[PDB]
Ligand binder design. Structure first.
Ligand SMILES: [Zn+2]
Length: 187
């Protein structure tokens, strides 16, 4: 049958495509883990981030999110000893800050995950592009969303990382018209 052309090879990526990718997520932890790890793709390929994504969980998932917000600069330097993932004490520091800004949003009982949803009018977006080139990476919500995270102090929010967030987060549905799941004319 027809399938998404986003993947050229690497069977691991396709498995990730079927697992989620394009499925709207409302979990704050899933969105936080996506925006933080997505920064790794910068310069690196999407496949590189997925492999390290699993290793990243080994160093951060066990510590949980609230803990990093409660960790000190010595903790990031201590784990740096293990580089199973890209090495960059500066990037690790962003993780601690990510939990600090994220935790502040919860203090008002308003998850920051709900905030991004409001940027798209709490309404899901869908597209019927035929080729990947037809899909535009410049959208009014993606540009405004990056400015919002930048204000929070989030790093690695380039417009490219922002568009990737909606793609993995599922805010927008971009699976061309040859992915079976996306018909475009078959209700
Ligand atoms: Zn697809």
């Amino acid at each position: 049958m027809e399938r998404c052309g986003w993947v050229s090879q690497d069977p691991l990526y396709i498995a990730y495509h079927d697992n989620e990718w394009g499925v709207p997520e409302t979990d704050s932890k899933k969105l936080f883990e996506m925006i933080c790890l997505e920064g790794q793709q910068a310069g690196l390929s999407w496949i590189t981030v997925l492999k390290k994504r699993e290793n990243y969980r080994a160093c951060f998932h066990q510590f949980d999110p609230v803990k990093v917000a409660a960790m000190q600069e010595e903790d990031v330097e201590r784990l740096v000893q293990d580089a199973g993932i890209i090495r960059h004490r500066g990037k690790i520091q962003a993780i601690i800050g990510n939990a600090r800004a994220y935790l502040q949003m919860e203090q008002n009982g308003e998850p920051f995950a709900d905030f991004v949803w409001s940027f798209v009018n709490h309404q899901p977006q869908m597209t019927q592009a035929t080729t990947l080139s037809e899909i535009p990476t410049s959208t009014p919500a993606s540009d405004a969303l990056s400015k919002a995270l930048k204000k929070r102090g989030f790093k690695f929010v380039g417009t490219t990382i922002c568009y990737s967030f909606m793609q993995a987060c599922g805010l927008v549905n971009d699976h061309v018209v040859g992915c079976c799941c996306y018909p475009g004319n078959k209700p």
